[PDB]
Write a protein that binds this ligand. Structure first.
Ligand code: HEM
Ligand SMILES: C[C@@](O)(CS(=O)(=O)c1ccc(F)cc1)C(=O)Nc1ccc(C#N)c(C(F)(F)F)c1
Length: 426
């Protein structure tokens, strides 16, 4: 259960802060000094490398993320979508999402409580993925997928294959090619239909609370076809649930072998929310220790391990001449595991993020940094606190003997094993 990132870690440690590599069968330079991270990520002068993102824009010759918000590299084209889409992420937009967050988390916990007999194995990876998908579908596009309740099996199956498609396409077979193409076309069709269903409600003068769909449509205002829209549809559908689910899955997985931390987490949910059923916005800020545990989870287990920038002009980086036209790779996974940046890096220790501790300085970036940072950071941090808070209040988890703690790389990092647990009530 090692990943290509673990090899980059070995080389960063051994060959220093500037290392030429092969990723996606392409030359790049991995750059792992905090000073280089600041200089390149913190300036609008450096932009994403279209070359490295082509594997999201299209897969197996089927259009996927296209020139959506993640995969668009040109600053001006990106800046135009971002300025608009940003509105759906205001403090007030996010406050409004609390209900969706509580509703899905509650439904999750209820489903789990029904299986909490200590004998039924439950894939926490699958359940968390269904939750995150149901949350995203509702919060972003105003649709109920009810995957938690067994619905939309074809859609979840389509996301699954598509993800494996992204996995096979850039790294490594007859049916897979067909399945993946079909899955990508199904996803884009799903988006067609949900855009239509929104348009027809609007056509009949119905009222629509501003959301992500509202701003994606709005950014597509004046285009002859809606292919840009479906790009942004698939972008958010995927990016707005997969990393959250992976992050939750890693956190649950790790906590199963951290009883003392669970005890403090439990003690904390009690003090701040009690046995209350609904979490208020202001409740989130007070779950400070849960916050540290999630931060520490992202340090060791970042679903999105890093990012690429195009270095346009030959530049000196930490004493090494790097030629112009070179993709720079930045890895929060790598830096998180280097003892030069984090003491005893392999130890899961949430006190690293405790009150009074200096904040890691450009050595930790699970949502990236600068202008290309994650638009959904706060959205994500909120949903996962809501979900974990409810789990911690009501349930205890035990990993099914034989479950491993390792990682795998699909389109993101996620647990190698499905996180099979048996459940008991707290
Ligand atoms: C804990 C979960 C999350 C983490 C770890 C996370 C991680 C990241 C990272 C590292 C970036 C940079 C990608 C790159 O440079 O190529 C990114 C991009 C972004 N993610 Fe997130 N993300 C998560 C949750 C969310 C959610 C919930 C949303 C949507 C609701 C979302 C939407 C976005 C989008 C659209 C981008 C592109 C931003 C831009 O270039 O303007 N993510 N995410
Ligand atoms: C194809 C690849 O899986 C591989 S990668 O190793 O070149 C890579 C991983 C993570 C990155 F942030 C950037 C690149 C990939 O680009 N995945 C990727 C990148 C960003 C995002 C975001 N946001 C996602 C996500 F699935 F949408 F979350 C996947």
């Amino acid at each position: 259960g090692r990943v290509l990132q673990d090899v980059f870690l070995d080389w960063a440690k051994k060959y220093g802060p500037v290392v030429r590599v092969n990723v996606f069968h392409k030359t790049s330079v991995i750059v792992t000094s905090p000073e280089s991270v600041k200089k390149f990520l913190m300036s609008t002068k450096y932009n994403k490398d279209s070359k490295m993102y082509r594997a999201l824009q299209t897969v197996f010759g089927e259009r996927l993320f296209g020139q959506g918000l993640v995969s668009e590299c040109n600053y001006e084209r990106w800046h135009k979508q971002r300025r608009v889409i940003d509105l759906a992420f205001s403090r007030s937009s996010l406050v409004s999402l609390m209900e969706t967050f509580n509703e899905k988390a509650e439904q999750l916990v209820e489903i789990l409580e029904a299986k909490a007999d200590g004998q039924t194995p439950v894939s926490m990876q699958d359940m968390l993925t269904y939750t995150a998908m149901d949350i995203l579908a509702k919060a972003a596009f105003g649709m109920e997928t009810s995957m938690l309740l067994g619905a939309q099996k074809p859609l979840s199956q389509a996301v699954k294959l598509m993800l494996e498609g992204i996995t096979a396409s850039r790294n490594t077979k007859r049916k897979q090619l067909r399945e993946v193409r079909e899955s990508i076309r199904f996803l884009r069709q799903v988006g067609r239909d949900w855009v239509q269903r929104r348009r027809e409600a609007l056509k009949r003068g119905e009222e629509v609370p501003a959301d992500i769909l509202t701003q994606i449509l709005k950014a597509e205002e004046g285009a002859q076809d809606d292919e840009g829209l479906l790009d942004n549809f698939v972008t958010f559908f995927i990016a707005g649930h997969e990393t959250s689910a992976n992050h939750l899955a890693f956190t649950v997985m790790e906590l199963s072998r951290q009883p003392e931390i669970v005890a403090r987490l439990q003690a904390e949910v009690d003090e701040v929310i009690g046995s209350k059923r609904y979490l208020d916005f202001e409740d989130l800020g007070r779950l400070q220790y849960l916050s540290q545990v999630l931060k520490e989870s992202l340090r060791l287990y970042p679903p999105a391990w890093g990012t690429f920038r195009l270095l346009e002009e030959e530049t000196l980086i930490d004493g090494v001449r790097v030629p112009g036209n070179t993709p720079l790779l930045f890895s929060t996974y790598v830096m998180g595991r280097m003892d030069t940046y984090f003491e005893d890096p392999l130890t899961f220790n949430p006190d690293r993020f405790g009150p009074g501790a200096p904040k890691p300085r450009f050595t930790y970036f699970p949502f990236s940094l600068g202008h290309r940072s994650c638009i959904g950071q706060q959205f994500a941090q909120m949903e996962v606190k809501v979900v974990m808070a409810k789990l911690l209040q009501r349930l205890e988890f035990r990993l099914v003997p034989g479950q491993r703690f390792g990682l795998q790389e699909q389109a993101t990092l996620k647990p190698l094993d499905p996180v099979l647990c048996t459940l008991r009530p707290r």
